[PDB]
Symmetry: C3
């Protein structure tokens, strides 16, 4: 009793931004890519299931010469066991447990989910996490789920992609279409992260809450959160980098799914950094979004996503101020 | 109604050239490799189909240490829609539209197709092309096909793999075994390509025609074409590089497919560069070919391909003059 | 009549060693990874089969930034034909023919098989080998198998991953649960390998014998062998490297497979280098092993593997002296 799906997609994708767009939200040019993965689950006995998943990203916008591997990576690689009502345990490269909140708004046709950074403690995909999850409180409270996650230190060659040991968890409750969630994690920073000019402190912290309504073809969600010493940043003026001492983040989304397959979307996102060395307060992300995806069926879709960028041109860190529109065509299986 | 094929091959492949063969057509040594891809198509309704394809090359002749990734790349990555008789549209990394002509002779057991360079405007696979294709003139003229293709600028880190914006197209007509085709495209060159010592001008151009007979187990084809500022070249003496101001190219092939599975092949190819800075005229490619593939069935084959190289030893750009023979064994699915 | 299996596994894997473990057997930290491959065989006729295989390793312990590709590689890539009782021939990247002996002890839950180095002449996976194998002596002697293998020179950018031309072979005999095997190969060393400070001589040689009992849920095996100028080594003091002039190697393993799925393991391995320039004799590997794998079924397992490391802290080459324990969870298909 094993079921394994090989799965994947090919995404023709193009970004339009003015001139460069070295000063835009998303950039400019061909951004085509493809994903390949497997996900499998085996029924060991009536109460026990083993499972594994691996997912890889292959850029489609590189040449076949020396730059062939740019932006190619494993996204996920983990395996786990799930026991009757006791919970599931998995270990590997997987989603940070703060993403249990951030996933609420990470729903846009192309962009969005800006604070769910990869290899960034608990907000995005990350290496070496052991994750325990429980559904419906051991089978006793329908709708009430929680998780705890242990993050092992990754002392890598850059501060940006490193972390120390840490712990995080999440609790959520869902009831006839509504959902609420909170997630928090904290971890040591490594000596290399500390040596960065930007950000100061021995612990990283990230938290977020989420509210959503997801029924009757309507999708509405909001996320609010803060981080300490955890959001990666760069000052394009001094070419210095590191982490924001604090940030406060808000993300809102509203979508509707029409039976004929159109799914319009609007959204707002703002992330503001505070106590940044040599700057003080400074916006990281600030935009409105209008977009749509058209689903032809479960295997084919197309979309447009427009980021009306509200970052101003005198942003003190050099964050791009121009708009970006993406257009995509997607075959997936 | 989705059909997706995972497909691939493992190719044990060895090249024999004298000494190095640093001065040969093809080189020398192990050239084993494998390909993995998917290709999928979904029937959206009776008249509309969505489709996607991704294909990757994994060299099999690298070690498992630092050189593990040499020559590994995505070859194709695109998705598209095809509507009743109106045409097909796809976007991504795909074959340049001049390959609609060059494919006629790109038929040898191992070598051949020399002017179908990758990441070279319209002659080979290339990034960021939007391609429209029409079969049988909207359903009105059986056998008459055309295409137009829009190439978005790729300002990459090398001249060799860069291009500016451009447009190309092709028209072909097939009738009881005979086929004729023409294709032309033109594009801006980028500032980096212009700064190269070899080749001068603001536009690249490539064109080719093709004639073939493909029936009764016979395959015969010829391609003639020219390029301006588009064929990549190197002078091994001065170690300078760039593009040939002009080239003129001819490719001929003849093959026969015996029912017992042997498919012998002979061929001629010559590509000559003109107005090369500091040289004038100079051959790029000039050889005869004799070879065969033996098909055991649709999944297994073996072949030998011998390139009787007619480049002379005093070639002014340093183009290799020695012969090369390849021997391959292929399992594919 | 083609059968192709896509296959793979996701392995959550963690190593525990004291402090660094820069001075341990196995290291420390997340070592998660995934494998993807295909293996196919086509029945050409009643007596002839074609076959191909490709296998790749994707690390799961890298970040998605610049280090994304570390430790990623093709492990195997070859294709072949197998004729009735005459034998099989394949060419590509495959197991060196000395591994026909070393495979006997390469059976531990995580570690073990220490002398089966990759890209190391005939002991491990290697590029450009043509391998002929015969089962049951042409169909005439049940249980008696042999092989010969031709290794083409690989002049790569490092000594460690290079080799010259060579030949190796193996002969084995199996009879109601017992097996005996011998394998030997020799090859030229390349000029780059010769220029290394460690190891001196024009030929590499590697041989090994094996004995095993494999029946009634018992597994016992021993391997003994020697090498000349073939085992790669480093002196962490002088930061010099190359090959051991000689080594002598022994590997023992004993395991039991309980019907309920537990498979305990114990093992001993010692590899000693001799005539090392500026040192004389020096241990390379010396440990005992205790471990177990628990198989839930054919798709799911977990294991622990503990290396009681007997290398001392004053080892003259700087070989790590500390212990390592690994813990893994594996989903495979
Ligand atoms: S540097 C110099 C400037 N552009 C050329 C280059 O990278 N050319 C170049 C040299 C070797 C391989 C490729 C390529 O992308 O095929 C090529 C040579
Ligand atoms: S440079 C020096 C010359 N050859 C050695 C090398 O690259 N050796 C070397 C150092 C590290 C990993 C590998 C390898 O291919 O395994 C190795 C060390
Ligand atoms: S060097 C300096 C130290 N750490 C930063 C880095 O590598 N940062 C860095 C620069 C660019 C991409 C990444 C990354 O891993 O995303 C980043 C900048």
């Amino acid at each position: 009793g094993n079921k394994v799906d090989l799965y994947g997609k090919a995404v023709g994708l193009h970004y339009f931004s003015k001139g460069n767009g070295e000063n835009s939200y998303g950039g400019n040019g061909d951004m085509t890519y493809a994903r390949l993965g497997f996900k499998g689950e085996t029924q060991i006995n009536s109460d026990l299931t083993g499972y594994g998943q691996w997912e890889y990203n292959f850029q489609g916008n590189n040449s076949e010469g020396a730059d062939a591997q740019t932006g190619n990576k494993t996204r996920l690689a983990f395996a786990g066991l799930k026991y009757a009502d006791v919970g599931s345990f998995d270990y590997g490269r997987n989603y940070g447990v703060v993403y249990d909140a951030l996933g609420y708004t990470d729903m846009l046709p192309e962009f969005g989910g800006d604070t769910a950074y990869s290899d960034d403690f608990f907000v995005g995909r990350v290496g070496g996490v052991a994750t325990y999850r429980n559904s419906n409180f051991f089978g006793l409270v329908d709708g009430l789920n929680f998780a705890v996650q242990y993050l092992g230190k990754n002392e890598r060659d850059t501060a940006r992609r490193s972390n120390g040991d840490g712990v995080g968890g999440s609790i959520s409750y869902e009831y006839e279409g509504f959902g609420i969630v909170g997630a928090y994690g904290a971890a040591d920073r490594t000596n290399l992260q500390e040596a960065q000019p930007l950000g100061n402190g021995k612990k990283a912290e990230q938290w977020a809450t989420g509210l959503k309504y997801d029924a009757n073809n309507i999708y509405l969600a909001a996320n609010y959160g803060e981080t300490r010493n955890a959001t990666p940043i760069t000052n394009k003026f001094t070419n210095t980098s590191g982490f924001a001492n604090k940030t406060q983040d808000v993300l809102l989304v509203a979508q509707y799914q029409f039976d004929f397959g159109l799914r319009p979307s609007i959204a707002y996102t703002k992330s503001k950094a505070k106590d940044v060395e040599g700057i003080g307060d400074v916006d990281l992300v600030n935009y409105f979004e209008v977009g749509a995806t058209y689903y032809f069926n479960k295997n084919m879709s197309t979309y447009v996503d427009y980021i009306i960028n509200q970052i101003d041109s005198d942003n003190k860190l050099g964050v791009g101020s121009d708009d970006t529109v993406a257009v995509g065509i997607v075959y997936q299986f």
